Design a protein around this nucleic acid. Sequence first.
RNA 1: GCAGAGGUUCUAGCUACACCCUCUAUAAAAAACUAAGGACCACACGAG
Lengths: 49, 313, 79, 218, 219, 49, 224
Amino acid sequence: VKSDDVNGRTKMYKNIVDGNHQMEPGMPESFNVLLKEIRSLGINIELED
Amino acid sequence: MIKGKQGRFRQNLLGKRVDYSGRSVITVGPYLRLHQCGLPKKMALELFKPFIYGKLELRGLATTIKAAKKMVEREEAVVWDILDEVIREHPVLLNRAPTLHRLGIQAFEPVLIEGKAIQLHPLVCAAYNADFDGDQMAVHVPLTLEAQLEARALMMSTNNILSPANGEPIIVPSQDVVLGLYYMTRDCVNAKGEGMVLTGPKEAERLYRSGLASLHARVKVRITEYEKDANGELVAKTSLKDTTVGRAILWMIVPKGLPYSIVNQALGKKAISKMLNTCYRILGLKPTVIFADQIMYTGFAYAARSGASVGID
Amino acid sequence: ARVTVQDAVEKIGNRFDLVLVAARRARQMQVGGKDPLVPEENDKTTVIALREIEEGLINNQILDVRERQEQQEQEAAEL
Amino acid sequence: VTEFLKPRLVDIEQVSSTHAKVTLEPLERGFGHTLGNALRRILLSSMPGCAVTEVEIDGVLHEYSTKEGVQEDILEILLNLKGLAVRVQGKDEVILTLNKSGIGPVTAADITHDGDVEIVKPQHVICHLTDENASISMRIKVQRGRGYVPASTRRLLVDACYSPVERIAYNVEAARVEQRTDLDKLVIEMETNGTIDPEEAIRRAATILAEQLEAFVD
Amino acid sequence: FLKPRLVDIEQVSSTHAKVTLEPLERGFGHTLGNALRRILLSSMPGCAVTEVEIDGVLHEYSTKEGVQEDILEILLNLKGLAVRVQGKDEVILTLNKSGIGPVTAADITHDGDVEIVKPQHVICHLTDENASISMRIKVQRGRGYVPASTRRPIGRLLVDACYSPVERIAYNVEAARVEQRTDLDKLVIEMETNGTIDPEEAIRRAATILAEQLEAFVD
Amino acid sequence: EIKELLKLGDLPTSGQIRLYDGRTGEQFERPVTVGYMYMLKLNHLVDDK
Amino acid sequence: KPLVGTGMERAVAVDSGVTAVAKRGGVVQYVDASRIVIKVNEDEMYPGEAGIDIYNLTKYTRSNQNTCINQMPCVSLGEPVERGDVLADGPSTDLGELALGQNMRVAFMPWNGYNFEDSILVSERVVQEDRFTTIHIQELACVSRDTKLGPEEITADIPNVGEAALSKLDESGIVYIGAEVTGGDILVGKVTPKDSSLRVPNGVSGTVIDVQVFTRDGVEKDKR
RNA sequence: GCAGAGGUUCUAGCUACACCCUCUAUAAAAAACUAAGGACCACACGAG
Ligand SMILES: NCc1c[nH]c2nc(N)[nH]c(=O)c12
Ligand SMILES: [Mg+2]
């Protein structure tokens, strides 16, 4: 939430001023950068479900 | 751009830089208890900005976020009163730069002060390995409710007394308090007030403050030595023990459970650490935090009266 | 205000369970409209939970029973 | 330019009838020490009190000696007497005689009245008696002095503790008044033998000081 | 008991004097001797310059032709000026000098009330034969040290004010020579003033402050 | 030579004098060292931190 | 000056460039806070075109570390001056003798823990005497680029601002030389072609000492 | 923006996660709602 989560920062900046101190993790943009920097290397790395 | 100390795996994924941070130089901060640390106002105002906005909205002072921002930048009288609310029970993490081991990053309860330096309880200036020759600590803030509760139930400076490497305590009195206690617990073979009989420590402190008796003097006093020999019960025994005025004054600071065979010797440094360890072992944690906080006050106060200076002779 | 939490962790032995069982109580005091059973005095909503746990008024079972009762009460209104 | 911040005390945390904690929030900057230390030095060693000064055991003349039937030596007996808190009236000197025989502690209640002498701690033990045939008897001398006159600077000689105060400790911490910067927040913890309450002790110790400065009050 | 009285005031020079308080009972002489010093060093009514406006210079860091001193040096010299005012809490002092030669505090035009106690205090030196300087000095009362920062036109300079007539207070306790008593101590206080406040009235004010403060915790 | 210079004025030869506490007003036992030391101010000021 | 110095203080100030050593011997004809005029002797001067020598002192100028570089006169009218002699004390230099700090009365003792392990307690007398208040000259620069859609303006007509901020601004859009600006104040007015005016960084509270304007050939110089 | 349109203000302000209001052809009566573009390399410095 603090460092890099585009849907986490803009959510908790509204949650705090609202009155409730909640959290939503999202997933860091740096990981979405590492995924691209490995996918563009000819190596297919994905996530299961 | 993947491997090495510059790659993602060690620069942008593990060590993400964080918001709600800060930095400043260190100061002695002696008065604050070991569960609280100083904080400049001009820093705590910027750290807790969203909380201030929310509290202003609750008060109705600001209709929108824009007005709240304007009044925060005004730094008027109302904003400080609001800041003294969101700071009440909100721990912050005082993090040293090269945190080698677990005790490097601890929690503290803020106490707003003027100036521009972060204060620090002296007894925790050993676990940090933090000097005062211009060192720089970084202040972080926990935001979520779980984080606030965690920085209270695990990270408060009163929660990690014993280091994880070994059972020995990590808040051992370090430089001035130990010298003051050592100068307190001694004996000169001839000082004014030698061989007298004293009613108790309540009277010894008065007989020393008046100047009628020197700090070191072999005398005879009576002491209520409390014993925990009965399981869960405190047995009170009182015997006319022979000791110095300085040692007798030191008796009132120690809790009741501990015996009298600890504050009677010369009281170097290892003796003080062992005294703290025994207090923790046989009295718990709550009556050891108070004892370790009171011992620093006594040590400083009686190392200031000593005038322990170094001269060529 | 509480500085030493050793009294609380005797009620909840893990002291990792203590934080998780106090966060729910603090949430039920911040978002939820419920009132603290301990007499509140100037304290924030995050140490009131620890104060309640110290008194033995709250543990991992009591709050679950209370939320089950809330569920039953909601079922009553469903008719 | 002569406007001075006069304090307004917030609470008086009275623990018991002999312990208290007086405090003053704004006070004045650098005035906390100037008031607390002055009060400590005036009341710790100068007060119109009264206590014992000298005892004479009818059987023992030499200080390093012991009697029979008592588990407390006269080294310990004389130590139990200087703590005995007694208040008298305008009379500046009176002799107290203690006469009791029987197994059991000789509490302060067994002291002969001898007139208008008042004792604040009847349960104050003096010397526990272990022999039924043993009989203890002595004479207690009291005076209306000041301070604490040790016997080393002066027939048994026992240190006289006239001043009713037993312990004094002041502190000073920052107490900002709202926007105004923090100054001094005096806090005083008094402990008294029991003749007079701590509040009366302070309100009599301040009278002496404020009455000393009577020729320099503009 | 006994009562201390202001028995003797003697001045060794124009700056500092030695007051005396003859009868005091043992221990007091060391209590008053510290109370009357801590009070004296921290709160006394003194007058010091606060705002200096020179005719031609805009800001502090600007040299002025014909003056040996930098304007900052002139301000720092003026901060140490020792003057006393009688009736009005605020006053404006006008300095007008011309020609080669040092300027001194005595060159300031004197009103009915404001009088300078050290007319040898040099402010600035005039070097050129056709140089001139005219400054307005604002002098006011005060208590303690008030920095300029914590307190409109560009041509008005600000100087920190230090209202403290007393510099160095020392005391000692000597045994009195009463013909029939003992343990009686007389007290002597030395007060290195700047020359504005009188000793006896200084002691009286520093004791009235105590008399007001003590009335808090007493009936 | 330092000792001779000290004796040239009045100050005690050993170089330590009896200070007095400011708050209490009492005396300091074990007289302490006093003198004049050259002290620079390093430019690592706190206003830039 | 250092109350106790090695003896190499009269050789670091002179040999460096901070001071202004006189290259000719004579007498001082006219001193001032910004210039010193020395009338040379007869022997030390050339037979023709000798005249007299003038030194110009550098007043407050920003250094590479944002500290003040100032020269103060060290002589007076009529005082003879010999060859190779200092007569202009530089920054951190007294009487042609290196002087970096200020000697202070120091006592070695623990004082209630306020000097715990390396801390240094400092009396109010230090601040009152202003023995350590240093100057810090700092430089700011506003640039008017030539972007697309039109160049930016330097004018003082700032939209969506109050009348308070423009009080410290002249007609041409430049702050008055001598104003006392603080954090967040507006220094020079630059409006981007649709509010980009330079502002003092937060915390800085100083006085403008001088403003120098550079103009490119071809564009018109404004009034200021 | 009920859908379309316009909007007080407190940069800009139907999306950035957005949000609300009044109105019926086009702007004008009103309060409550948010936080922006900054890479690499050399030199010097401080602390552990
Ligand atoms: N900007 C015009 C306007 C005024 N009020 C508004 N409120 C909302 N939610 N959005 C807007 O765009 C506006
Ligand atoms: Mg260090």
